[PDB]
Design a protein around this ligand. Structure first.
Ligand SMILES: *[C@@H]1O[C@H](CO)[C@@H](O)[C@H](O)[C@H]1NC(C)=O
Ligand SMILES: *[C@@H]1O[C@H](CO)[C@@H](O)[C@H](O)[C@H]1NC(C)=O
Lengths: 504, 107, 75, 132, 101, 50, 75, 50, 132, 107
């Protein structure tokens, strides 16, 4: 529910003591958490919006030249005036021109002209800046419980909180007063100030499309500056990346507009994050967020809810997620009231032996009439298994053949750990529920390694770090005993390892 | 493609009669059949979705049943505004097939 | 006007796909490929240069890679 | 209310192509598959094909392979059916009604159906007459 | 005289943007618009589940297609070593004053 | 010889073939069929979906 | 869309000034200059790499120039 | 019930053959009956002398 | 004798497409480029385009790219020009005449010309009238 | 796309007169021009290929000349079957341009 078939979903251990777990949820890929007969609940970040942003430096990627100007002071008659060069809308490069009896001069030599042409602008690009103020997350909570198939894409049904609850999270209030009608609240507290490295990123805007930009890249662009804002036509700074005028054969000046730099800067961003912006309200995807969940206000809605012998007919044919779970949708044929429906995995007969693990805890029917559709997420054991639904005699079953070993799940978990510690860095080490000095050590070593690693190898992307990884691995194949022996397997491997899982 | 035979071709009955219609597919359609009545050249009147279910707004004199491939539509009481052409519709596999039709006439 | 800050220098590594990542992870390699297709003699020239440095028979290949990736890009 | 409204009747020549519109009202236009269904005067109904108004995907029957193509307009919330290579057999009345479950893209059938499978918003019935 | 070798577009206008997906084992994605060859098409693998629409679960193909129309282009003409004329100005020092043009 | 708008250059053919932009050719007919047309667009999806 | 054929590969050497020669003869150097201003730690990293190759004390500087001109441009 | 993956074609027939040859300058060749997917095309080189 | 003979006059609607035939007699059909040339009544001649009857390649003017298509028929020795997206400006008389040194394809500019550059074969012409 | 100006617009002369027509291209078409006379709505009569050459079957009262860009057509003796609309046609670069026309009238 909001997290079945959405893949790159992870699930974490449990409640582990304190009833207070940590998780770094993100924009794509969501987290189910499950803990010790409390309702399993999954959380997704979808749209982090930023309002109220200010405008640091702009850039003009087109030019509009006119009017030009000219000088022509004969040689050894001094330097030329051109009043327009006193005004700041005009651009000038004084050059030297060979002259003679042709060009209207008595003496021979260089004449020192400059055509000073009027710079103007059309279609600039803006570089709007954001601080952690006026920021927002809109996280969503979707407790498994009992919902239909049509109520897991259904965004509108959060107006009454059955299990769906949208929760607006701003960094001035980093706690989620998050009630879930039917049972108790959840109440997760966040750290939005340690977001996705904010106050280091700008919204770059060209024309109706916007993307995030690292600020050192942004200040290193050579185009005009437009430092504050857009009232009238501004004072354009630096004026030399654009309009280019030169001299050949001592005939006039080729004054070139130098055109339009959209594709130039679009090629120049290859590490940007596309956002979208509407009334300003710059909505943003690709964020991650370290909200730590607090349990113990959660409570299973009606653990009692008597067993309800009935007839179970499937609505839909059940399936099997790529994170090895099974999704079953039953009708219950409408006997009586809100009451529990048990399910089992059976390696034995049709009845009488449970294996595996139910994901959705306390699965239930909410309403009395004919077809209440409860969907169940289940976790079969690695071999063969049948599905048992409530009644000890009158029921319908399955077979699944899980098709993956426990060693395959361990390898998939290590590949997911590779992608975690590649994407989120040291912050990915905060999935494991609070570990005292264990995860504090495992976070401290990575935050004192990754800072120095960002200082050394921060400026290298896929193909330029493949080369250094290959070279340092070749060095570690042929060096001495000591430190440099354990250099390649720790560092060239970690370069190619941070490369090949970014995506892909 | 999934032939859907509709029996009979046309009928006639007086006001207040019970009448039944049969649709047989050459293939297994589970419970995937639907039922139309269409007044000629007009916006129609709604009978049956999912071969056994009425829709809200439909009067309850219409009913449908059928389990394997044979499906029975049933009007409990014929009324003078129930003269129409009656169709049944498969849902399975695609080239969605309709029946030929069933016309009624007021006696 | 040469918009020299390639943002791959400061790429963001977040779980979504980036701005041009799919067309980014091949572009420098196929640029070098087109350059050595258009200038095949510099391979023999760089071999004669790199054979004169290192005297190690495995540093020769390293100097070959160094020169033949200098020559397309920062050239 | 939830309603599909079509264009008027058309008279075309054989060998030409006809275009029939189907405009939506009262519901989210990108949430219901538009099915096109023909009806000759005598012969009952016959399903022509299906478009998704989201993403403009199409499919159709085997009797019309290469003869029909369906386009969309998300702005005006309209569905266009262009039937090419017209014959005297194509003189019929054309209908368009929403399939319903139209989550992602194309026909979906092992998932649920019914409740105006497509029996609700049928515009009116565009008469298309192919003659000289 | 010139001969037109290749032309290179720049400013592209994109519309009609079609898209079609298939359930994770129901084949490759497709849409009629691919037979038009004015349109640009790529096929990515997306997720799919009950909360996506139809399928078993897993990853299914998705094509998206966009109209491609151009506004600015280079003509790119050819030069052959015939077909040209060099203009040479012969000028004799003598009875002439302050000339040069 | 190479014409952008009103500006005109002389370039090498070994340069001009190697440019990765959509080219036309020589057929001067309707939908100029732009080959490539993949350089000048870029198809970007979500994390998994649309 | 990355318009990789820089025409400096096939520049013409005729007696007139070229298309962008005046702004061309500084651009790669100031690109490397801005890159090493923005990433100063890779200088120490490349020194530690290049000190491990060559063992000649004059090939070290050559590997430094090679790596520190690979890293802005072919990167 | 069975889904419908790739069909194939194992027996073909071709209609009219169109050619469009281009000089040794004026570049490559176009052939307007290209740019529809019903026709299958591949390009080769010919002497093209006097 | 050496002669090109066309179809009769046609009356079409705006937005439709017209097809004009051009059949050869008296010479080898795959040896002479067929040029199509329009003529408005209140205007002079205007060259529409060129087909080679060998290999069926086309070229045309800038005022009609995308609107004109030229096909051949080597068996019946006939040339088809299909003009699409008709407007009221297209009401004209259409011509089709040869021009030799038509050995391989396309145009053949700098090699030889003249001797019915395209003068002779023209025949009766084809009036095309676009109205309602 | 070379613009081909044809002077004058229309003329009139009696039977047996000499008349000359001028065609000027904006660019160099050196000997690539030819000349039509077209009777209205009819199959035409042949004048000149290659700007200076008569064709077999043409009567010899027609002649053409011109070297750089200016081309002169010349009828030595006007006859009552020579009333037509006179055109000139470029050969070069292939947006093949015709002149506007030159009409004659019998006095
Ligand atoms: C979505 O939820 C609303 C209640 O807010 C309900 O009326 C509607 O039927 C639901 N739709 C689906 C497809 O489940
Ligand atoms: C310039 O023109 C005048 C008269 O127009 C002429 O006499 C003189 O010779 C010309 N100058 C030269 C250098 O020929």
């Amino acid at each position: 529910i909001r997290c079945i078939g959405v893949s790159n979903r992870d699930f974490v251990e449990g409640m582990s003591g304190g009833t207070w777990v940590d998780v770094v949820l993100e924009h794509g890929g969501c987290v189910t958490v499950m803990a010790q007969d409390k309702p399993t609940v999954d959380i997704e970040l979808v749209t982090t919006t930023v309002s109220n942003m200010a405008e640091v430096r702009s850039y003009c990627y087109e030019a509009s030249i006119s009017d030009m100007a000219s000088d022509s002071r004969c040689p050894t008659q001094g330097e030329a005036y051109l009043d327009k060069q006193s005004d700041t809308q005009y651009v000038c490069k004084r050059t030297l021109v060979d002259r003679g009896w042709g060009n209207g001069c008595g003496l021979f030599g260089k004449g020192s002209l400059v055509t000073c042409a009027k710079f103007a602008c059309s279609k600039k690009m803006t570089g709007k800046s954001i601080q952690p103020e006026n920021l927002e997350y809109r996280i969503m909570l979707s407790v498994h419980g009992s919902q239909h198939s049509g109520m897991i894409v259904n965004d509108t049904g959060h107006e009454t909180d059955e299990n769906r609850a949208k929760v607006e999270i701003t960094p001035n209030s980093p706690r989620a007063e998050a009630t879930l009608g039917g049972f108790g609240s959840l109440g997760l507290d966040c750290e939005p100030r340690t977001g996705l490295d904010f106050s280091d990123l700008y919204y770059l805007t060209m024309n109706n499309k916007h993307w995030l930009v690292h600020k050192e890249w942004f200040h290193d662009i050579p185009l005009p500056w437009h430092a504050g804002a857009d009232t009238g036509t501004p004072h354009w700074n630096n004026k030399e990346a654009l309009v280019e005028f030169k001299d050949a054969h001592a005939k006039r000046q080729t004054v070139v507009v130098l055109g339009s730099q959209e594709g130039a800067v679009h090629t120049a961003l290859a590490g940007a994050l596309e956002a979208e912006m509407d009334g300003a309200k710059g909505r943003l995807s690709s964020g991650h967020l370290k909200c730590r969940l607090k349990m113990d206000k959660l409570r299973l809605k009606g653990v009692s809810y008597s067993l309800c012998t009935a007839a179970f007919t499937f609505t839909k044919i059940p399936a099997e997620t790529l994170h090895g779970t099974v999704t079953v949708e039953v009708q219950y044929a409408g006997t009586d009231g809100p009451c529990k429906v048990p399910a089992q995995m059976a390696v034995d007969m049709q009845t009488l032996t449970p294996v595996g693990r139910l994901i959705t805890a306390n699965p239930v029917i909410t309403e009395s009439t004919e077809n209440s559709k409860m969907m169940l997420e289940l976790d079969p054991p690695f071999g063969d298994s049948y599905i048992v639904i409530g009644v000890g005699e009158k029921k319908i079953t399955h077979h699944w053949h899980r098709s993956g070993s426990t060693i395959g799940k361990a390898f998939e978990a290590t590949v997911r750990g590779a992608k975690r510690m590649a994407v989120l860095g040291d912050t990915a080490w905060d999935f494991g529920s609070v570990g005292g000095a264990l995860n504090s050590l495992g976070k401290g070593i990575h935050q004192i390694f990754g800072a120095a690693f960002k200082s050394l190898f921060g400026g290298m992307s896929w193909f330029s770090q493949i080369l250094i990884g290959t070279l340092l691995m070749w060095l570690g194949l042929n060096t001495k005993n000591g430190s440099i022996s354990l250099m390649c397997l720790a560092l060239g491997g970690v370069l190619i390892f941070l490369s090949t899982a970014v995506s892909a | 493609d999934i032939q859907l035979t509709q029996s009979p071709s046309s009928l006639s009955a007086s006001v207040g009669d019970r009448v039944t219609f049969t649709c047989q597919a050459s293939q297994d359609i589970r419970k995937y059949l639907n039922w139309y009545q269409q007044k000629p050249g007009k916006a129609p009147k709604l009978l049956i979705y999912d071969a056994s279910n009425l829709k809200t707004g439909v009067p309850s004199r219409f009913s449908g049943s059928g389990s394997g491939t044979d499906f029975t539509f049933t009007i409990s009481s014929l009324q003078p505004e129930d003269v129409a052409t009656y169709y049944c519709q498969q849902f399975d596999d695609l080239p969605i097939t309709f029946g030929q039709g069933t016309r009624l006439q007021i006696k | 006007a040469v918009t020299l800050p390639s943002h791959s220098t400061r790429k963001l590594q977040t779980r979504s796909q980036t701005w041009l990542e799919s067309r980014e992870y091949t572009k420098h390699l196929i640029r070098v490929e087109n350059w050595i297709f258009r200038n095949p003699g510099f391979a023999l020239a760089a071999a004669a240069i790199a054979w004169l440095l290192g005297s190690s028979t495995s540093q020769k290949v390293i100097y070959l890679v160094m020169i033949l990736l200098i020559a397309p890009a920062y050239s | 209310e939830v309603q599909l409204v079509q264009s008027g009747p058309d008279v075309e020549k054989p060998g030409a192509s006809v275009k029939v519109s189907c405009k939506a009202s009262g519901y989210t236009f990108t949430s219901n598959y538009i099915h096109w269904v023909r009806q000759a005067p005598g012969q009952g109904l016959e399903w022509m094909g299906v478009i998704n108004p989201r993403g403009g995907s199409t499919a159709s029957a085997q009797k019309f392979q290469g003869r029909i193509t369906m386009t969309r307009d998300t702005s005006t919330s309209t569905v266009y059916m262009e039937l090419s290579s017209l014959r005297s057999d194509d003189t019929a009345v054309y209908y368009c009604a929403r399939g319903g479950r139209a989550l992602f893209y194309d026909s979906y059938t092992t998932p649920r159906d019914g409740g105006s499978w497509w029996f609700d918003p049928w515009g009116q019935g565009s008469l298309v007459t192919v003659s000289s």
